[PDB]
Amino acid sequence: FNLISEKCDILSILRDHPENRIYRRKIEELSKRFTAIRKTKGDRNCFYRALGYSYLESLLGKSREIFKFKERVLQTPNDLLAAGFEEHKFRNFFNAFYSVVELVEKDGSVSSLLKVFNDQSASDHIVQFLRLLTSAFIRNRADFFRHFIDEEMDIKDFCTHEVEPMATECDHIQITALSQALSIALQVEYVDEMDTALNHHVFPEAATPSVYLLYKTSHYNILYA
Numbered sequence: 001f002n003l004i005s006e007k008c009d010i011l012s013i014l015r016d017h018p019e020n021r022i023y024r025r026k027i028e029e030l031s032k033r034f035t036a037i038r039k040t041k042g043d044r045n046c047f048y049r050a051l052g053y054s055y056l057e058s059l060l061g062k063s064r065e066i067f068k069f070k071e072r073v074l075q076t077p078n079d080l081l082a083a084g085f086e087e088h089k090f091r092n093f094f095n096a097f098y099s100v101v102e103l104v105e106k107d108g109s110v111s112s113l114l115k116v117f118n119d120q121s122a123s124d125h126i127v128q129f130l131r132l133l134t135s136a137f138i139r140n141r142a143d144f145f146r147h148f149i150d151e152e153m154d155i156k157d158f159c160t161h162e163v164e165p166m167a168t169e170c171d172h173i174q175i176t177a178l179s180q181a182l183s184i185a186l187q188v189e190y191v192d193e194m195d196t197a198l199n200h201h202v203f204p205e206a207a208t209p210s211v212y213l214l215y216k217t218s219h220y221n222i223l224y225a
Contacts, residue, residue: 005039036224044167054211083136096125135159137181179203191216
């Protein structure tokens with residue numbers, strides 16, 4: 001369990017910032033709304049890895065929602081092709097992602113899903129897929145991302161440098177894009193070391209979340225309501 005941990009009590013993470021007043025206050029507050037946490041490896045891939053694992057875990061045993069998600073996943077090659085990715089270069093990553101969606105459907109266990117996400121090869125192929133899908137979604141909607149995020153940004157260069165490569169850290173653009181690309185509602189809790197309110201954001205605004213993440217020290221861990 002070196003990429004995604006077993007479930008732990010939320011206050012187990014106090015030991016990560018011992019004798020730190022502000023972190024202790026915010027983790028204690030967080031423990032009022034959330035009961036448990038899973039830790040993810042801090043390797044630069046943890047947003048993709050955590051969203052992928054937590055969303056698929058949220059589907060287990062839900063036959064309608066699995067059917068709908070599979071229907072969307074089967075269309076994602078078209079998104080990739082429309083953005084200029086070549087099928088023979090994305091095939092291995094798409095196949096790995098479709099494989100774990102089928103495991104959610106056929107096997108239906110947390111244990112099986114956690115084993116795939118802790119398999120370095122399967123897990124990294126999944127992350128690479130999610131990165132390419134994020135890139136495709138931004139590229140195909142470049143006007144949207146310029147209008148609403150930043151009119152001055154260079155979309156193609158951003159995707160090439162800060163989305164597609166493994167180990168590249170995320171910002172709110174990648175979160176919004178991957179949430180929209182897979183129709184995943186997620187809530188991010190923000191814990192920094194400033195003497196400020198614990199606060200969160202829901203991607204997109206309207207929505208009931210499937211996934212809750214804790215963002216702290218440039219890192220995403222998985223929360224349980």
